[PDB]
Amino acid sequence: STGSATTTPIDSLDDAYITPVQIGTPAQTLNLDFDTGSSDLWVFSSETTASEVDGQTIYTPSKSTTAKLLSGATWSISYGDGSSSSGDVYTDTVSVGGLTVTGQAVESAKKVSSSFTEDSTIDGLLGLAFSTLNTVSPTQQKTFFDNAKASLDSPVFTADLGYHAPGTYNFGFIDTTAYTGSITYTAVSTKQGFWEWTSTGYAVGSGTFKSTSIDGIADTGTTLLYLPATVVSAYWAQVSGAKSSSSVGGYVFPCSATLPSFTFGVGSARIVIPGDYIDFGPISTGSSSCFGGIQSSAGIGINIFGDVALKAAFVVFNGATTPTLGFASK
Numbered sequence: 001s002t003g004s005a006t007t008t009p010i011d012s013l014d015d016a017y018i019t020p021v022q023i024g025t026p027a028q029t030l031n032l033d034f035d036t037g038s039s040d041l042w043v044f045s046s047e048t049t050a051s052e053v054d055g056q057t058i059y060t061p062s063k064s065t066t067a068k069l070l071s072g073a074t075w076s077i078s079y080g081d082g083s084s085s086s087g088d089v090y091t092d093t094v095s096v097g098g099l100t101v102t103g104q105a106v107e108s109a110k111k112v113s114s115s116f117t118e119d120s121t122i123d124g125l126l127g128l129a130f131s132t133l134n135t136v137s138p139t140q141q142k143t144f145f146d147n148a149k150a151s152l153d154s155p156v157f158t159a160d161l162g163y164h165a166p167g168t169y170n171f172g173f174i175d176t177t178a179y180t181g182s183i184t185y186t187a188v189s190t191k192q193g194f195w196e197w198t199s200t201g202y203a204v205g206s207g208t209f210k211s212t213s214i215d216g217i218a219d220t221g222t223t224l225l226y227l228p229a230t231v232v233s234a235y236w237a238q239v240s241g242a243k244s245s246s247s248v249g250g251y252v253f254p255c256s257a258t259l260p261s262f263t264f265g266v267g268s269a270r271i272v273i274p275g276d277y278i279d280f281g282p283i284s285t286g287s288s289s290c291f292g293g294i295q296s297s298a299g300i301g302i303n304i305f306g307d308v309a310l311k312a313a314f315v316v317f318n319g320a321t322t323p324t325l326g327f328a329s330k
Ligand SMILES: NCCN1CCOCC1
Pocket: 010, 015, 016, 114, 115, 116, 118, 119
């Protein structure tokens, strides 16, 4: 089998992408943030504290004839950005772009932190990292991809995010019309539960490529590109007026600038992120300063190839027994 669903930016800056997901019988469609950096499929629900719901579509398991309460199972997650959520677990039929998984764990939120409440466009998350990071306790649950894996024509999923435009998540197949050149695959370490790989280096604009190993994760659930301070400083040094701001929380630059591209290595292949993708957006509407799409990973503990980087490529998350990651230009 296969599935194909369109993913859409939630706002004019691509702060996050939402993909419609069908849950239950009859279908209840919720717009979830597909996150390759986490492994819980959780939704705003009929159990969520009313004061913490502000415009989101909720999942009501009592209205689903296929919903089954997973007795004694609870979940509680805290993300790298400081946001959190928790609640109970049901199993239900979940479909993404025509691909159906029966008995998928759907984590019904009872509580969500304020960061979630204020994003009316995000009805929950659909985790696509390895199932070893799933928070369901005591019985750890599998991700939608992990459950679908055996039934798919090929055990893979692809991310094709658009810049200020819709994109696609495909399951079980590779669309050979969606990219230029070829897909270069690279090794993945599953030791930390992430799609963790090693980039072979970088270039700033038309500069000479520097061969240097950069371990990081392909994370569709992170908005920006987070790289070592050395790399990030060499990039922003090419932009007049760029500087790190403590009030904004990172590199800002004058909105008047046209930015250089940033290239990252995938084996002997090169993915070029256009300068416009790195011009993330104004720190406020009408502001003099704009927030950088490339930021330092110094306080995080891991480098993150977030949406700024992934939207420049067709990305294959290969879930075979020994997982690999593929990148193609587009
Ligand atoms: N609620 C703050 C976080 N979110 C994250 C996704 O984009 C919008 C802002």
